[PDB]
C-alpha cells in the first residue's frame, strides 16, 4: 500500500515492518552470505 | 526444544502468528480465532 518509508535505525529496540512482516527487536549488521534468491533468514524452530 | 517447536503451531486457527491474525481481521471473531491458540498453549505448558 501507499505508506511512507522511514530511514534506517540500528542498534536500538524498535518496531519494524519489512514488506508486511511486523515485529519488534533490535537491528544489527551481520556477515550472512545471502544468495541472490534468498530473502528471509531462519534457524532452529522456524523463527525469523 | 519440543516446547519451542510446539509454540509455532496453528491448533485449528488460520495462522500461527498473533500479529498476523491481529492485523488481518476485526476483533469480534479475531478473539475466537486466537482462543484456540490460547487453549493449545495452555495445554502445552501444563504438559511440560
Amino acid at each position: 500500500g501507499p505508506k511512507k518509508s522511514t530511514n534506517l535505525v540500528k542498534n536500538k529496540c524498535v518496531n519494524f515492518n519489512f514488506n508486511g512482516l511486523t515485529g519488534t527487536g533490535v537491528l544489527t549488521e551481520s556477515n550472512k552470505k545471502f544468495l541472490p534468491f534468498q530473502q528471509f533468514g531462519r534457524d532452529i524452530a522456524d523463527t525469523t | 526444544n519440543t516446547l519451542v517447536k510446539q509454540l509455532s503451531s496453528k491448533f485449528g486457527a488460520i495462522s500461527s502468528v498473533l500479529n498476523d491474525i491481529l492485523s488481518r481481521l476485526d476483533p469480534p471473531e479475531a478473539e475466537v480465532q486466537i482462543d484456540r491458540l490460547i487453549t493449545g498453549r495452555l495445554q502445552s505448558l501444563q504438559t511440560y
Binding site: 534457524d43 532452529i44 524452530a45 523463527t47 | 526444544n1 516446547l3 519451542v4 509454540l7
Partner: peptide
C-alpha cells in the same frame, strides 16, 4: 580439579540459546 574430574568434565558435552527468548530462562 584432579585429572579424573578434568576428564569427566571434558567427556560430558553441555544458536539454541537464542531460541529461548519466548519467556524461557535458565537460572544458574
Amino acid at each position: 580439579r584432579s585429572p579424573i574430574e578434568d576428564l569427566l568434565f571434558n567427556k560430558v558435552t553441555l544458536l539454541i540459546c537464542a531460541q529461548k527468548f519466548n519467556g524461557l530462562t535458565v537460572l544458574p
